[PDB]
């Protein structure tokens, strides 16, 4: 059930603050999101296709 609290008013602090956050873990693991934000260093020119090419060795 619930405890000993019987106030009519909506809790002034939201729940994620008033209480701990119950989480549940699934047995088989979970995939991290793909990206944690948009910060990134980028590697360009990695590959090919296009230059002063095919004078270039085989």
């Amino acid at each position: 059930s619930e405890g000993n609290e019987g106030v009519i008013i909506n809790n002034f602090y939201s729940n994620q603050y008033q209480n701990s956050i119950d989480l549940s873990a699934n047995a088989t693991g979970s995939d991290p999101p793909k990206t944690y934000g948009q910060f990134s260093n980028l590697l360009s020119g990695a590959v090919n296709a296009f230059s002063n090419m095919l004078p270039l060795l085989a």
Binding site: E5, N11, Y13, A25
Partner: protein, 231 residues
Amino acid sequence: SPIPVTIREHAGTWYSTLPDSTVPIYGKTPVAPANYMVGEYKDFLEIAQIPTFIGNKVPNAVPYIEASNTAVKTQPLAVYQVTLSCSCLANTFLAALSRNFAQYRGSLVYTFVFTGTAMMKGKFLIAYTPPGAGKPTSRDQAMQATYAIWDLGLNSSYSFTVPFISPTHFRMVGTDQANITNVDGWVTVWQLTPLTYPPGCPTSAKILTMVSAGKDFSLKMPISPAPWSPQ
């Protein structure tokens, strides 16, 4: 635009049991998943129903009573006062649970497990006597109140329920002082017929005694018993 307030006289008090919450200082903290967990209960009533052992022969307590090969109508095998304070119940979960509340209501269940030989035979008279005229002094007087006859045979135990008979809707859990000739009556156990046996068999047997709450049983108003030390 600042809002006007009237400060109540009780400004600044702290109430140990306030129906409200306080200031959170470390929000957004996720917990460690505990979802694999089992065995949880949510109401004490959920487990108050499990029988635990009544202590006989206090303070040299044993979890049983002994039936003999003689039926003296004048001699009870046991006499329990129906009080959640009986020194008899002092260590049952019922009593340990109950001591944290002010009042109770409902059925009490006394369970007897016969532990003698399969070859033994016998009959017991278990009675509940409401208060008013004192405790019964012979099986003949007990037999005048609520009672059951327990016959020994294939089935090992007997569950006796003492009916809640009371003027008030609830009864106080604990005693202030000691409760006289009062309390709420008595559970007395008597032999109707003696334990009988064949040659080659012991002439007395132990009967395990336990107590539990009935489906009826209720408790209300949480408090704290007088503090004690187990030693």
